[PDB]
């Protein structure tokens, strides 16, 4: 049983990771590590201008999609107990049994 935290901002990612580990230390569950996935980056290069005057000057837009995985083997009742957490909207939660 694993839980994937897919995040847009790394600061809120680390905050919700610290909150989850702080809420998971006190229970009798073997908490595995928040595995650092490699950061996804969607680079887009843009002409900067509707009409072609001047030098070939290009916008270079990026994103930094971050991803963490934890492994918490438990029955589904304990999973639904852990599931109810108020979260910042920059982080998405998925579960996989």
């Amino acid at each position: 049983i694993r839980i994937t935290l897919t995040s847009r901002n790394v600061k809120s990612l680390e905050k919700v990771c610290a909150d989850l580990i702080r809420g998971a230390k006190e229970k009798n569950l073997k908490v595995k590590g928040p595995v650092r996935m490699p950061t996804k980056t969607l680079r887009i290069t843009t002409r900067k201008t509707p009409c072609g005057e001047g030098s070939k000057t290009w916008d270079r837009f990026q994103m930094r999609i971050h991803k963490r995985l934890i492994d918490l083997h438990s029955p589904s009742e304990i999973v639904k107990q852990i599931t109810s957490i108020s979260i910042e909207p920059g982080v998405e939660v998925e579960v996989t049994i």
Binding site: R8, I44, T46, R47, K48, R60, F61, Q62
Partner: protein
């Protein structure tokens, strides 16, 4: 009536933009439909930063 021949399943004429249907300028295959004229204005709103 025959208003719609040319079934338009491919090519430049099929790609219609989400913003202003600027099918002359190209529309990128990024899970996205912009112009490059309006993606500049709306990239910081949809989540793209320059850095």
């Amino acid at each position: 009536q025959l208003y719609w021949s040319h079934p338009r399943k491919f090519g430049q004429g099929s790609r219609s933009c989400r913003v202003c249907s600027n099918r002359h300028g190209l529309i990128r295959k990024y899970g996205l439909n912009m112009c490059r004229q309006c993606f500049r204005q709306y990239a910081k709103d949809i989540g793209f930063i320059k850095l």
